[PDB]
């Protein structure tokens, strides 16, 4: 019973991290549980929003954090990164009866919602010359203002959006385009946590082949490719 690790978790990214009911389920929630009873560690969830969990980390308030967080050479300087744990990216999603948004590059000169803090926005403000970039705490928000077209498109993470067309969205919002930027989501640390950043990789080779990654990802990601 050393003591209770204090795991950081976004407030609402589905599949990943949602709030159901009383308690909170996800794909991050599955994993660290196994990990953590792999290592044999006691901890607890703290839900916050995004662009708090890496200031969370660099004030040391928090032991550790799995949100999406995407392993990023800038975010390194800053906080240090697991092995990677889910292979994602961005993608586009507009209303389902727009037709003249084909891919990211018709977003040109257009209104983009994104989520503050997050990478979807570095990615916008270096690749899009959007006429107006609008930032929101939670991602819920840029999707009504899709929703009621005051902005053209939302770009976010692909499992992110591909779920929310698939639970929530009700064939009112599509996904057009390829995914983007190609990115790794690892579980992030504070510096100097390097001792149980080594026991959660290693926790993390041995679901991985024992095959209860397999279960946790079919049980979010159906049929998804490796």
């Known amino acids: 019973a050393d003591k209770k690790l ?5 407030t609402a990214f589905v ?13 991050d929630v599955d994993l660290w549980a196994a990990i953590a009873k792999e290592l044999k560690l006691d ?4 839900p916050m929003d995004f662009s708090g969990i890496i200031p969370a980390l660099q004030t040391k308030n928090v032991d550790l954090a799995l949100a999406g967080i995407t392993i990023c050479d800038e ?12 292979k994602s990216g961005l993608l586009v999603m507009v209303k389902a009866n727009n037709n003249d948004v084909k891919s990211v590059k018709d977003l040109d000169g257009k209104v983009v919602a994104v989520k503050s803090g997050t990478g ?3 990615y916008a403000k270096a ?3 959007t006429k107006d970039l609008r930032q929101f705490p939670n991602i819920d928000n840029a999707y009504m203002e899709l929703g009621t077209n005051r902005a053209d498109a939302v770009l976010h993470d ?19 385009g390829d995914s983007l930027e ?3 989501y690892g579980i992030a640390f504070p510096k100097g946590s390097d001792e149980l950043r080594d026991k959660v990789n290693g926790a993390l080779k041995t679901l991985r082949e024992n095959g209860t990654y397999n279960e946790i990802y079919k049980k979010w990601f159906g049929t998804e490719p490796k």
């Open 6 to 10: 204090v795991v950081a978790t976004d």
């Open 15 to 27: 599949p990943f991290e949602f709030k159901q009911g009383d308690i909170y389920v996800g794909f």
């Open 43 to 46: 901890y607890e969830l703290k």
């Open 75 to 86: 975010r390194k300087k800053a906080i240090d990164f697991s092995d990677g744990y889910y």
């Open 120 to 122: 979807s926005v570095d």
């Open 127 to 129: 690749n899009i010359k």
């Open 158 to 176: 692909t499992p992110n959006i591909l779920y929310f067309i698939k639970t929530a969205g009700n064939g009112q919002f599509k996904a057009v």
């Open 182 to 184: 190609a990115q790794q």
